[PDB]
Amino acid sequence: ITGRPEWIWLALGTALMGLGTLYFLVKGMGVSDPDAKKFYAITTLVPAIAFTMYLSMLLGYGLTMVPFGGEQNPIYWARYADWLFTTPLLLLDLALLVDADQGTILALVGADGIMIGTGLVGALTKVYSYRFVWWAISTAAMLYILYVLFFGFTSKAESMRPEVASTFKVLRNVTVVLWSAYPVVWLIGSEGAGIVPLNIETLLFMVLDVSAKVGFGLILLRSRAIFGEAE
Amino acid sequence: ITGRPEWIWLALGTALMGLGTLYFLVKGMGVSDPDAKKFYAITTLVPAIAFTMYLSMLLGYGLTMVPFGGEQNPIYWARYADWLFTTPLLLLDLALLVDADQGTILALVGADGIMIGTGLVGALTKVYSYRFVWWAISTAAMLYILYVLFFGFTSKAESMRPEVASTFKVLRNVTVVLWSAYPVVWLIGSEGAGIVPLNIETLLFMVLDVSAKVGFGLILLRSRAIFGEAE
């Protein structure tokens, strides 16, 4: 484990995702509202999945070597197995908050799968220049997601209860800022141009992951928007 | 790329799926009917997924070598990753058109997963004679799907609006004819008996894919069956 300088950030990430999972699990014990139960189930699964994948990276299972640039490059593939399941769950939290229609939910989840799937292909591609073709396709899929979150959901939240509109607006802004950083870290990190070393890259993804999952969840599950209007 | 004679058909397929995706995306911009939005989302995702997998084959990522018959045989595995997601989406288009019940939808999607999954196992199997055992199981799963589309959905469409009944009947006939060709191309192509060479096999799958996805989508999204009855 300790033979890799980035191990400290993988261990911290593992701990923070595990602690986040347990807090949400305990906090959700005393909840019977069927609407609130939906948000607790979605939001608790997110850091639980991330916990297992951070642990796999810490123990060395989620790491492979990819030859490109005449070098064997360490690629943590477990990140994409994490994101494949956690990013659509996070979008479902937002879509259920605004009572989005089914067709829009399917478009979001499908574009998200394309985003993560093409990012994985780009991470494992051995022809250096082709890695950035996949990065560009994946980034186009992300821009579609961000467009929908702004010019489809925002207008839908305003016609909703005030507390669900204000909570959505906050979580929307958090998501757009944090998610946009991921393609940048990829491009300048060891998967892309190799400007930033792997140990610093790992620290950046850990800060982003914890903020986008645990921080996101703390804002959502403390809001009254997750409960139905009741007397 | 150009070192493979089949590259021209992979490049054409990539272009036609990309163009198809963009047309459906633009055409769906001016749509607010929640029913129509469902069909546009399903139908636009189909060629978008196929685009990415054709590109992976063009660039050489979606290709592996499988030893059988005393030879290293080029097997494009990316086809099955495509079909795993696009064939159930196409069946969902048909099932939603006739307002099929949930139990029937699950049976269709499950049989479809078995069809594609066993076809993938057959494509990667190293014992030559066993490849055709998997082909037979996969073909049995397809025949179940075709039976349901005829002796379960057809009777359901007649009790529906006339425009949804006539549109379903057309898309049903297109699907049964085109899908039935796939097991035949597999059997006589490089995955099976090896009668037809890979470059011709690739041309045939490209014609079938574009027809079953883009051609299918053009018929559906030009129909009024996708809109609810409104004044």
Next chain:
Amino acid sequence: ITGRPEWIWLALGTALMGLGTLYFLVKGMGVSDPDAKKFYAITTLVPAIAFTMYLSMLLGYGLTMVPFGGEQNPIYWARYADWLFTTPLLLLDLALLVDADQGTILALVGADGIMIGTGLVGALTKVYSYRFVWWAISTAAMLYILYVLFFGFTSKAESMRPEVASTFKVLRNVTVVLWSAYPVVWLIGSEGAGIVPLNIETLLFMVLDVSAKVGFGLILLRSRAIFGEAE
């Protein structure tokens, strides 16, 4: 095939899953109740999936070698591909029986995916002591599932029709007893401590699989709880 002593139990399992699939398929022909159709579709898919994965193990495709303990250990990975899809389908049978809320269904299916996913990682892990870390995480996920089936569903079934309450109680008890045996067989078998040899381990999993899928299905599909109350 016959070069492996466990082949006899893989062949028996294949036959019993295939026969089970055909019986459920025939029995479900004469069913039009939309509620009953749901249970028949879920319950017939379970042994059909298991059939294909037992066949892959029989023919040698679903087997790999994992080095640990200074030895190349035969690991049947196809079991986890089976369980990944069949265990959530079995939980869906139970959840639909008691009309569970959506949030609870998602929590069950998500915990089940974590259970199977971490068990697969543990089966393929090359550092011997780490294999049991994954076993423990997977077992914690199972205990969560069992808790929900007892202290969330049981109370919900009592407020239901008497026949659905008594049928659920029976299937609940069958599930908790049979599922609990799996982590024990893993721990003492070739994936874990290696006390029980592989051929005996394979026999035990076959008895458990057939009972948990075909036996489970025979109890459910003979009950009147799967039909709506009708005159």
